Amino acid sequence: EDRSYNVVARFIGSSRNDPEAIGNLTLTAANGAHVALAQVAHIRLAEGET
């Protein structure tokens, strides 16, 4: 109608609850193989200014 909303694709719940899960998340590659980002992007924990 006159109203409008957004549309969002998001990982479900515990999919990311923590660093370990996010590490095990996947994305594609040039060679056509799913690769966990933990194999490429180093995931750590640090505090930072609010």
Binding site: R16, N17, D18, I22, A41, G48
Partner: protein
Amino acid sequence: QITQAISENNANAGGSILNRGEQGLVVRGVGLIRNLDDLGN
């Protein structure tokens, strides 16, 4: 294709908020280019 791909390869994004218990965690990440050694990739 080179210029398109290398101009596409440079970017960053925020991860909103991850909740562990009552603790909110701003998910931050950066692959942002800094030195010229990272330019080679």
